[PDB]
Structure 1
Amino acid sequence: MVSKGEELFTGVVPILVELDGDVNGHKFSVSGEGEGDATYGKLTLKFICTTGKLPVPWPTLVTTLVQCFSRYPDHMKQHDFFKSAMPEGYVQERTIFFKDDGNYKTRAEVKFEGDTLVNRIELKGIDFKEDGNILGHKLEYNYNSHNVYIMADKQKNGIKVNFKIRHNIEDGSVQLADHYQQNTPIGDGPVLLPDNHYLSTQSALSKDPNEKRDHMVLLEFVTAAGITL
Structure 2
Amino acid sequence: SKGEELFTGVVPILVELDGDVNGHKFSVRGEGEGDATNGKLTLKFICTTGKLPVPWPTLVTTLVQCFSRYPDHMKRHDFFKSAMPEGYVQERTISFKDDGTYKTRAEVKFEGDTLVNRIELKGIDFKEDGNILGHKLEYNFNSXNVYITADKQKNGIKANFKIRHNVEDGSVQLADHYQQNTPIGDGPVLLPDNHYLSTQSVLSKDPNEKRDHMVLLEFVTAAGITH
SS state of the match for residue 29, structure 1? strand
* Alignment correspondent of 2:34: 36
* Alignment correspondent of 1:135: 133
Which stretch has the larger CA shift, 161-170 or 63-72? Answer: 161-170
SS state of the match for residue 156, structure 1? coil
Deviation at 1:223, TM superposition (A): 0.5
* Alignment correspondent of 1:83: 81
* Alignment correspondent of 2:154: 156
> Counterparts of 1:171 and 1:39 in 2: how far apart (Å)?
39
Deviation at 1:161, TM superposition (A): 1.1
Q: Which runs of 5+ in 2 are unaligned?
A: none
- Give CA deviations for 1:162-218 in whole Å, capped at 9, x if unaligned: 111110111111111110000000011110000011011100100001111000000
Deviation at 1:4, TM superposition (A): 1.2
- Give CA deviations for 1:8-37 in whole Å, capped at 9, x if unaligned: 111100000000000001100000000000
> Counterparts of 2:183 and 2:160 in 1: how far apart (Å)?
18
What RMSD over aligned residues (CA atoms) do the two structures have, in Å? Answer: 0.5
> Counterparts of 1:75 and 1:177 in 2: how far apart (Å)?
33
- Give CA deviations for 1:94-126 in whole Å, capped at 9, x if unaligned: 000011110000000000000000000000000
* Alignment correspondent of 1:17: 15
SS state of the match for residue 180, structure 1? strand
Which stretch has the larger CA shift, 29-38 or 163-172? Answer: 163-172
Q: Which runs of 5+ in 1 are unaligned?
A: none
- Give CA deviations for 1:108-164 in whole Å, capped at 9, x if unaligned: 000000000000000000000010000000000000000101000000000011111
Find 1:171's aligned residue among 169, 172, 175: 169
SS state of the match for residue 29, structure 2? strand
> Counterparts of 1:38 and 1:8 in 2: how far apart (Å)?
10
The count of corresponding residues between Structure 1 and Structure 2 is: 227
Which stretch has the larger CA shift, 135-144 or 158-167? Answer: 158-167
> Counterparts of 2:94 and 2:13 in 1: how far apart (Å)?
24
SS state of the match for residue 121, structure 1? strand
- Give CA deviations for 1:45-71 in whole Å, capped at 9, x if unaligned: 000000000000000000000000001
Q: How does 1:100-115 map to 2 (within 5 A)?
A: 100-115=98-113
> Counterparts of 1:222 and 1:21 in 2: how far apart (Å)?
26
> Counterparts of 2:161 and 2:5 in 1: how far apart (Å)?
28
> Counterparts of 1:217 and 1:72 in 2: how far apart (Å)?
25
Identity of aligned residues (%): 95
Find 2:183's aligned residue among 179, 182, 185: 185
> Counterparts of 2:159 and 2:78 in 1: how far apart (Å)?
13
* Alignment correspondent of 2:204: 206
* Alignment correspondent of 1:117: 115
TM-score between the two structures when normalised by the length of structure 2: 0.99
> Counterparts of 1:82 and 1:177 in 2: how far apart (Å)?
24
TM-score between the two structures when normalised by the length of structure 1: 0.98
